[PDB]
Design a protein around this ligand. Structure first.
Ligand code: ADN
Length: 295
């Protein structure tokens, strides 16, 4: 429930991308920089309407803010994520930014906060259904993360019970969260070594295949990550529990407030061993952890 806008007051600019349906472009509105997604032929009409009703209910710090809409041509006027997508930060073009373990953990904590808010909606919970880096936006110097484009999304982040058509719950979003955590820690695309048609990934994941273990990952983070990957949905933690756990771990990950400002020359040596090395460094975590415990 909120704000209307007339297309004639919006100055469309360069296309910034295309998601599940419409097309997102850069733009201006009332001298404020905005981002807008419009339809490209009805059919997206139905979907766009659902997005409106949903987006009109949500109000949270970690979810893209909607400014208004319009059926003149029909489009959403959202806030412009200066920082771009998390996909582009991770796997984008040449000058890729350097990021730390604190950033990675912080992005994941903020993601779970936004999703925990959706899962706690009343009358009934909203499931995202399409959690993946292309749908995670960064602002405030790549410091603050926000979720966008609700499913209502490649097979690399989908919970197996979802492809198999079968019923599913908010626990499908918890599975995607687990994969995104592996992905920001290793800075590798999940199942990139499978490729081919999507059905080859679905088959692998359906038979129990998960992203390779990370070398030297902290036990408390590894256990949280693998629990989210559980075949059995009921065995995955709730998004609320993930928020509590991640919040407590952040105590050993200081520096999440620092903006992304250094360009890194990221290598990436695959060689399918029996594990992968993390992109981020956990040496400070262990030292700060050790200080609070025994080691
Ligand atoms: N508010 C926004 N600001 C900047 N880019 C956006 C926004 N919403 C969606 N996008 C872009 O939409 C493309 C298609 O969803 C994504 O790759 C993402 O970078």
């Amino acid at each position: 429930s909120l704000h209307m806008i007339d297309y004639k007051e919006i100055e469309v600019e360069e296309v910034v991308g295309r998601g599940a349906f419409g097309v997102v472009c850069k733009a201006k509105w009332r001298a404020k920089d905005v981002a807008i997604k419009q339809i490209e032929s009805e059919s997206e009409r139905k979907a766009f309407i659902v997005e409106l009703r949903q987006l009109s209910r949500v109000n949270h710090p970690n979810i893209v803010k909607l400014y208004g809409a319009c059926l003149n041509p029909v489009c959403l006027v959202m806030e412009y994520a200066e920082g771009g997508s998390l996909y582009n930060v991770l796997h984008g073009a040449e000058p890729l930014p350097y990021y730390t373990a604190a950033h990675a953990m912080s992005w994941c904590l903020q993601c779970s906060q936004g999703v925990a808010y959706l899962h706690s909606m009343q009358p009934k919970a909203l499931i995202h259904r399409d959690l993946k880096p292309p749908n995670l936006l960064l602002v405030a110097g790549g410091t603050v993360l926000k979720i966008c484009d609700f499913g209502t999304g490649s097979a690399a982040w989908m919970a197996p019970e979802v492809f198999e058509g079968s019923n599913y719950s908010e626990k499908c979003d918890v599975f995607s969260w687990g994969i995104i955590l592996w992905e920001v820690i290793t800075r590798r695309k999940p199942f990139d070594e499978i490729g081919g048609p999507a059905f080859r990934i679905m088959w692998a994941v359906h038979n129990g295949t998960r992203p390779p273990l990370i070398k030297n990952l902290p036990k408390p983070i590894e256990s949280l990550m693998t629990r989210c990957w559980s075949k059995d949905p009921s065995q995955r933690p709730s998004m609320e529990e993930i928020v509590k756990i991640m919040t407590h771990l952040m105590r050993y990950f200081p520096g999440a407030d620092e903006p992304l400002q250094y360009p890194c020359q990221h290598s990436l040596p695959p060689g399918e061993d029996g594990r992968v090395e993390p992109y981020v460094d956990f040496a400070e975590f262990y030292r700060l952890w050790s200080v609070d415990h025994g080691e």
